[model samples]
Target chain A: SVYDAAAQLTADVKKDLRDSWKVIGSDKKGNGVALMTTLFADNQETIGYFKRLGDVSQGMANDKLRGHSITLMYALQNFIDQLDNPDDLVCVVEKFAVNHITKKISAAEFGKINGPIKKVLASKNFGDKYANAWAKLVAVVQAAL
Target chain B: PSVYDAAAQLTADVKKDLRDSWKVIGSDKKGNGVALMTTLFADNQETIGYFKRLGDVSQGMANDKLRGHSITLMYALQNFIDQLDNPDDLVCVVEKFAVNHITKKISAAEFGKINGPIKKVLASKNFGDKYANAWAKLVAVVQAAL
Candidate 1:
């Protein structure tokens, strides 16, 4: 079901899809942390939900954030790896929907994430096609969840 | 701060209370673990899919699989509590637990539902509002790890 949206992709687009993810994740942990830190900076209101973290201003120094950044990145890695098959993609969507719901996260939270997803891709030389494919996938993920 | 850093606000008294209270229930890991899970399953009817080993929730508490799993769960909590002061280790064990349980289809919210059962069980131990508020913070961090 989730792949129905991604079903439109051709070979070249899938190439742009997975490889572009690799470029952004060349430093997977680093980029994940960067995206998280950036989100925290811009959305102090959202930070209130995660007050379990002792301090928002500390950036990457926090252990929970570091662990969380890696966790989210690993899930992204799984998503990219699964794009070749729709069956697995649907499984990923089910887990993600409930996972974030547990954390009280919604599409609006991920809406904030999409902008930075592209910004990170753009600045890191992922280029237009790469970022474009990601935009489609991110939207697919956001809407599905 | 991101909720990730909530450990700072966790307060020293809370940490000590956690460690102190943990010493009691944690002493008999499987025993208390059984109590926690029993009440957890009894109070929450939605956990059917999460623990299929028992098949039916009614016969679960007396089942050996239940005790075995409760022990596993308790030990995991032990690991989390043992590393409470050390964020790296705390998050390390917790994040790993979160990822490993991903296949089980258990939501972070489901992990949170244990709070009521735990607080209820801990009343005989040295538990009160002060310690409970501390536990809320710990569970929050663990949830974020998910």
Candidate 2:
């Protein structure tokens, strides 16, 4: 279950989230921008649904897209912070899962984001130790999504 | 930015209004869900077959078919009512409804029709004007997504 995955997020794993986040999430106006930019760049399906993005070709310059990326980073940060309390984490992920079901994003579609996330980490020389822990976290999210 | 202002207009007090009211309605999310869906399907007859895979609604609402879906929809509603404290999280669920409906070509006017039955159900439960007002606000936010 996603909650059990959440529970597996041990104290050391939680540190990886915080530390890895500081590096990857810290990508901010730079990497944060790059992460979402990479996602949309690689995944054309995402380009169509995101309403505020003006042109897929020039969207990197679009403040709306950048703002959205930053916003998501912050939200992820919130989720990482809440990992301490597994119930709250379950609540949030269930919300995410329910959203995916009703909104009709495919498992394949949900799976697409993973590659871009991993790619960005590679760009930063993010640690193997951190990567393994994050993998565990993503599995938790994956089961529910 | 999909459901960007999902709870922008809901005030601090509005959150409390919704929580208190849902406390009553969600007390038996399963039972009340059946009651609501029973009536919702009764009025919106066309929508029944759409849920055919869930169960045969004609089997009388208590059957596993209708009962199962009633609970599913109940949780969707509960997600909205439960997460008012986190507006970002609130947007995550309700915005999907908009995107989902749009993708399926289900018009807002069609979806909005449920408001009537919804109000009546809450009223039947003795949910007062305050609760009614807050529920309306939640619906308005949800409907605005479409």
Candidate 3:
């Protein structure tokens, strides 16, 4: 079924991601902190990895959070842009998987970020189709990790 | 080397060269824009007057005004190449862009001028016909639009 979901990742799904993403990426810094904050809320232990957050209780004031958020947005944009080229898509995902692994990030923790990411997308009115597409993408990424 | 090459579809090699050249140039956004703008001014001295709004290329390259304009130009060129496979879309986008330039007294002919310097930059960097030939074809495409 996961394979089916990946297979169903059509042009329409990509369009939805792009359309929704434009809004989120517009407020890149703010949205990034929101996504990260949501992730930290879900899994408070992961916050330790972000040394950039420092002693900032709210995490909003952390300059590193902005950089990390922009970095994540670029990664997501790159992934979306290359979706048409399966080879390139796989390469991007593989590169992300390798980098996270080296950073001591577990696949389980990586998957957890998907929830916050999806929540943001859903807030932008992304439907079940987009959700499925993202889930399938995460499945592929998890396998790579 | 024929200027009419734009009438024909771009060859795979030419497309590859275009992509390769851009990959190198776009890898360093700030440097790429500055180098391309600098080279354009160096080769086409007269055209520098056309961009008085941006100041001297020597001075402009350092400032955000020039840097931002150069970056936008780079993106426009990149988009043109990226849509090479779809001429209809490319033409639509270019024509829309031309409207803005025309309003500012910048004709398609003036836009074509940048290709020469861009090709020179590519040739200096790659030392091959890959970029040279593609640059020639790309110029013709813009010329035809004009």
lDDT values, one for every candidate: 0.68, 0.67, 0.64
Per-residue lDDT of B27 in model 3: 67
**Which number leads on DockQ?**
2
Tens digits of lDDT, candidate 1, B1-146: 24347545557887888888888877875568778877887888777567774555566445655654565566566656756766665665576667656667666787789888888878867578777777777787766755
**Candidate 1 wrongly placed segments (more than 4 Å):** B1-146
Per-residue accuracy of model 2 over B1-146 as CA lDDT, tens digit each? 13556478788888887887788887775567777777778888887765655556766544644554555566667657655776765665566446556876666667776776777778887876777777777887777778
What ranking of all candidate models by DockQ puts the best one first? 2, 1, 3
In the range B37-56, model 3's lDDT, one tens digit per residue, is 88878887988887775655
Which stretches of model 2 miss by more than 4 angstroms?
A: A1-145, B1-6
- Pairs clashing in candidate 3? none
Query: Fnat of the models, one by one?
Result: 0.05, 0.00, 0.00
| Candidate number that wins on lDDT, 2 or 3 | 2
**Rank order by TM-score, top first?**
1, 2, 3
Q: What is the DockQ score, from 0 to 1, of model 1? A: 0.04
TM-score for the A-chain in each candidate structure:
0.85, 0.80, 0.81
List where candidate 3 sits over 4 angstroms from the true fold. A1-145, B1-8
